[PDB]
């Protein structure tokens, strides 16, 4: 199961731990220690979800939902019946995500490339632990974390984001949505740019990177360039998730009231809080 050019790269070494022990592949997949650890925490995980049905109810995956321990349990332990399963599954999830990230690192070393890819993964894991750890621990109960269920984590969002009025008024939520919208915009153009040059009009020759910069300059008067649009891609994405964890850890800890009323500090500024007219006052 090798690519026609792949043999030269499958040299031993680069492992973080274990050495030449787990240095080997299974078909297209590289294993390493952390491929073993990932499959460990993974397989251990699915066992406990599948368990939560002997005691939870049906087998329909649209209905399985491992909810966290109740609020009365605090950060203390809980029986596996009601919440205890959640806590262990959360460990296997983290253990599988960290093992996945360290696995890519071993792969990066074998290839002699930069570590930029597992680093970008880290920001996703940060946002995950924000919701199932830091945001509750700081709150004092595991019942504040979202449950692991298909349509039941959407009900968590709809109930959590409405406890503070309309969530759109959370300011970091505002900034976080912006990057998500822009990064999506940035994908759209970058994907079209490369293709529009490598696949030009029928019968014409492959356009150069010059034809790409000339396009943007004609269209908006500036082109970020080939290396720029990639630096831009990494930032818009990591910043989107960044504020999407920031907007959560402030919500309910440093600010627990309606998010729309937070904006009153701007309206209630002394130099204009009393001039009549307009909407407010």
């Amino acid at each position: 199961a090798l690519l026609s050019f792949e043999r030269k790269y499958r040299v031993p070494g680069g492992t973080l731990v274990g050495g030449n022990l787990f240095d080997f592949w299974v078909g297209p997949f590289y294993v390493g220690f952390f491929g073993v650890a990932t499959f460990f925490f993974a397989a251990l995980g699915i066992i406990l979800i599948a368990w939560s049905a002997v005691l939870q109810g049906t087998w329909n995956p649209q209905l399985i939902s491992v909810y966290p321990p109740a609020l009365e349990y605090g950060l203390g332990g809980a029986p596996l019946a009601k919440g205890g399963l959640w806590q262990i599954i959360t460990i296997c999830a983290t253990g599988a995500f960290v093992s996945w990230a360290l696995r890519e690192v071993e792969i990066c070393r074998k290839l002699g490339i930069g570590y930029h890819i597992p680093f970008a993964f880290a920001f996703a894991i940060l946002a995950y632990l924000t919701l199932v750890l830091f945001r509750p621990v700081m709150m004092g109960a595991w019942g504040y974390a979202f449950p692991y269920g298909i349509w039941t984590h959407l009900d968590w969002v709809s109930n959590t984001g409405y406890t503070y009025g309309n969530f759109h008024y959370n300011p970091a939520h505002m900034i976080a949505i912006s990057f998500f919208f822009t990064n999506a915009l940035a994908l759209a153009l970058h994907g079209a740019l490369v293709l529009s040059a490598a696949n030009p009009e029928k019968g014409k020759e492959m356009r150069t990177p010059d034809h790409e910069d000339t396009f943007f300059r004609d269209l908006v008067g500036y082109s970020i360039g080939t290396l720029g649009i990639h630096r831009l891609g990494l930032l818009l994405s990591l910043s989107a998730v960044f504020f999407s964890a920031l907007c959560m850890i402030i919500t309910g800890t440093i600010w627990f009231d309606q998010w729309v009323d937070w904006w009153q500090w701007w309206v209630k500024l002394p130099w204009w809080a009393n001039i009549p007219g307009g909407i407010n006052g």
């Binding site: 997949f29 890819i117 920001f123 990064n183 994907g191 500036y222």
Partner: protein, 300 residues
Amino acid sequence: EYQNIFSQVQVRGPADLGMTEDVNLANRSGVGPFSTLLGWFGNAQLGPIYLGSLGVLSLFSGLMWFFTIGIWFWYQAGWNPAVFLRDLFFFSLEPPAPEYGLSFAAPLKEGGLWLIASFFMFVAVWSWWGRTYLRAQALGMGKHTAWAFLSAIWLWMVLGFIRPILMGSWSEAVPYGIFSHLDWTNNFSLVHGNLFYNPFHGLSIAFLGSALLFAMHGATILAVSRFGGERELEQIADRGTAAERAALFVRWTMGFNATMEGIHRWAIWMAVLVTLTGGIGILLSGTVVDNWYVWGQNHG
């Protein structure tokens, strides 16, 4: 180890007047300055920008739409700058009252000013759509940007044009304002019974997705910039080691593989699908389906 998120050294040469081909050149401006500030991240040359017939029509219409709303903001602010700066996020230009329906002649202070700004917005965006097409044609390139731009237009058009006509009223559209179009997005979900139960809303989020793919692709080319991976076309026409390692990191990590041109096929489609499914979800909401919780109760 050195990363590659900022440049250590900057070089600069004569202003790049760009490729020529069948471009008009008479509509290219004097080159702008070179900002060292941008040069650290990406490029530093500003301009030259091309402004044709359509380039002016859109830019004119766009200022016309922009100024129309702000005039209304000044009216609401009592022509007072303090009330303007304070209540800025709160002012709004709402569509005509539902009593008028699709009647194209409503009073200004009761929605007529809305349709004025919409006409400017309608001609500004479309004249810009045609601008993105002819800028590709003038260089003999694929029009893929104009085609993906249509997807954004699609959602935009459904939000404030097709759906209002299908529901028989202008009042179903979106008002122009910051805090106002946020509340519109809210109540829409509530009038139609939680858009979470909309299957197209779920897919549109899933493709939004783009943040995952654009995080990976950016990190991968930076990771292989040591082999000149940022030169993405010459690696298509002549695969280097930079494209081989990039393919094998994807192979060795998750399984299925990706070519240099192959990954951009994923890229453009991940984005265009965001607003593609999104427009379909809004189009059916209210016109065909009145409550997505009730629709989802029948599993379809």
